[PDB]
C-alpha cells in the first residue's frame, strides 16, 4: 500500500485498501473509513465494481437525465466519489470550511456553501436527487466568482470548478461533445 493519503498526500494514521494500493486518513475517505470490515475496499474500488458489473453504465448520458436520478445507493456513492475527487485537489482548501464575507465593494452571497457542508449533507442523506448535490457544488464556485469580482483570486473558483466538472462528466459518463 501507499504510505501517504490518496486525498491530502500526507502521512499519518492511514487505513489501507484491501483491493488496491491506496491508503486514507479516516475522515479524508468519503464515506469516513468504516469501523470494522475485513477486507475493506475503498471508494475507488467500489466505483470500479459498479462499472464492471454494468459495462453499459459507461455509455454516454445526458446531464439532464443524470440530475433527475434519485439518490439510490449507487448514485449516493457516485456523488461521494465526485466530492472526494474535489478534495483531492489542494486548492479545495479554499472551499472546505465556512466562508465569511467582508470586502469593500462586494456583498456576500445569499446562500453560502462550502465542501464540508456538502459532505455533512451527503452523510445525513439530505439529497433526494443527484441535482441537489450538483446544485450545491456549483453554488460554491458561483458564489466565489460573484464575490471576488475582478480580483485575480476569482481564478481559484474557476480552477476548482473545472476539477469538479471534469470529474462529474467522467463519473456519470456524460456524453462527450464539442
Ligand atoms: Zn488525508
Ligand atoms: Zn481501493
Ligand atoms: Zn448490466
Calculate how far, in angstroms, residue 71's C-alpha sits from the geometric centre of ligand 1: 26
Q: Which ligand is nearest to the CA of 17?
A: 2
**In this structure, which ligand is nearest to the CA of 43?**
2
For residue 33, give the DSSP letter. Answer: P
Domains in the chain (CATH in brackets) are: 1-59 (3.30.40.10), 60-178 (1.20.920.10)
> Which ligand lies nearest the alpha carbon of 55?
3
Q: What are the distances in angstroms from CA 24 to CA 88, 146, 172?
A: 11, 34, 24
Method by which the coordinates were obtained: X-ray
Ligand 2 centroid vs 40 CA: distance in angstroms?
8
Looking up cell 463519473 gives 171
**What is the stated resolution of the deposited model, in angstroms?**
1.5
Between CA 7 and CA 18 the distance in angstroms is: 17
* Gap between the Cα atoms of 155 and 159, Å rounded: 6
Alpha helices, DSSP H, located in the chain: 43-53, 63-67, 73-87, 93-96, 115-123, 130-148, 154-171
Q: What is the distance between the alpha carbons of residues 156 and 120, in angstroms, rounded to a whole number?
A: 23
Amino acid at each position: 500500500n501507499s504510505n501517504i493519503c490518496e486525498v491530502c498526500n500526507k502521512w499519518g494514521r492511514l487505513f489501507c485498501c484491501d483491493t488496491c494500493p491506496r491508503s486514507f486518513h479516516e475522515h479524508c475517505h468519503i464515506p469516513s473509513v468504516e469501523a470494522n470490515k475485513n477486507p475493506w475496499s475503498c471508494i475507488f474500488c467500489r466505483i470500479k465494481t459498479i462499472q464492471e458489473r454494468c459495462p453499459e453504465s459507461q455509455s454516454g448520458h445526458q446531464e439532464s437525465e443524470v440530475l433527475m436520478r434519485q439518490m439510490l445507493p449507487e448514485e449516493q456513492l457516485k456523488c461521494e466519489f465526485l466530492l472526494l475527487k474535489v478534495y483531492c485537489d489542494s486548492k479545495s482548501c479554499f472551499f472546505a470550511s465556512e466562508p465569511y464575507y467582508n470586502r469593500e465593494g462586494s456583498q456576500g452571497p445569499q446562500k453560502p456553501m462550502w465542501l464540508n457542508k456538502v459532505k455533512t449533507s451527503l452523510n445525513e442523506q439530505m439529497y433526494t436527487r443527484v441535482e441537489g448535490f450538483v446544485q450545491d457544488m456549483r453554488l460554491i464556485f458561483h458564489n466565489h466568482k460573484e464575490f471576488y469580482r475582478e480580483d485575480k483570486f476569482t481564478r481559484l473558483g474557476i480552477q476548482v470548478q473545472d476539477i469538479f466538472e471534469k470529474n462529474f462528466r467522467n463519473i456519470f459518463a456524460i456524453q462527450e461533445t464539442s
